[PDB]
């Protein structure tokens, strides 16, 4: 008879999220999902569920969808295909019974955050995977591996805004005026050559990022060099500062 546990094998995950082991870090105010394959010697599962402890681990169960809200009408969801449990070879190598994860987490949910949650697949004889071992209680995700965790990051930990190159930054005064406007932030700001292109709209209905001179900046200059601070508002509302330099000269 089957003695062994089924088999977490891979995990993976697309859009607003990284990945680093069991744990989701995910940046505020961006769609992510992610897929959870699992295999037993059995080629078979029979039951999977996430459950918010690990105390049911040994009881096998199947959940559909269950979900957690995170702040601006926002939520993660893990859902199991259960239409595909309990078949034969539907946890194989070459076709792993694979679980997902979608969702979000809106611009008032604070950094840090952190959920733990807990996912169990069993067998027709009932071994189930990962153990019983809470991992909140023994301060350790990787104590328990049906375990996996969402950290909440901020969108500025995401993105580096830089200076397009191609504009100009060296004026000269016309013949009579002593100053020149440098205008509106946005002209200045792109994303650094090979980091992500920045966002523009949030999820949260009304969120995108802006681009504005940080307050207190002087923007009608003299003859003279200068270093002005721009500012980057994600959508999330945290926020990059660049400096960004000007020279205005007088006219000859
Ligand atoms: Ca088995
Ligand atoms: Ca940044």
């Known amino acids: 008879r089957d003695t062994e546990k089924p088999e977490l094998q891979k995990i993976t995950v697309t ?14 105010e961006e769609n992510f999902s992610a897929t959870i394959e699992f295999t037993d010697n059995s080629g078979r599962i029979e039951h999977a569920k996430f459950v918010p402890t690990a105390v049911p681990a040994a009881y ?52 840090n955050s952190l959920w733990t949650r807990y996912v169990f697949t069993y067998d027709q004889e009932g071994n189930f995977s990962g153990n019983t071992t809470d991992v909140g209680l023994v301060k350790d995700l990787t104590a328990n591996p049906a375990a996996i965790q969402f950290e909440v990051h901020a969108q500025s930990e995401k993105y580096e805004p830089a200076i397009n190159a191609e504009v100009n930054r060296n004026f000269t005064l016309t013949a009579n005026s002593g ?71 007088p006219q000859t």
């Open 179 to 249: 100053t020149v406007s440098v205008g509106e932030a946005s002209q200045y700001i792109t994303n650094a050559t090979g980091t992500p292109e920045l966002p523009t709209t949030g999820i949260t209905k009304g969120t995108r990022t802006t681009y504005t001179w940080k307050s207190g900046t002087n923007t009608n200059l003299s003859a003279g060099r200068h270093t002005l601070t721009a500012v980057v508002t994600y959508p999330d509302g945290s926020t990059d500062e660049i400096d960004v330099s000007f020279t205005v000269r």
């Open 60 to 111: 096998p169960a199947t959940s559909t969808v269950v979900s957690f809200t995170t702040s601006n009408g926002q939520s993660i969801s893990m859902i199991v295909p259960t239409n595909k449990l309990a078949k034969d070879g539907n946890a194989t190598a070459s076709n792993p019974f694979t679980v997902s994860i979608t969702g979000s987490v809106g611009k008032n949910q604070a950094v």
């Open 15 to 28: 859009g607003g999220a990284v990945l680093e082991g069991q744990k989701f870090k995910i940046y505020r």
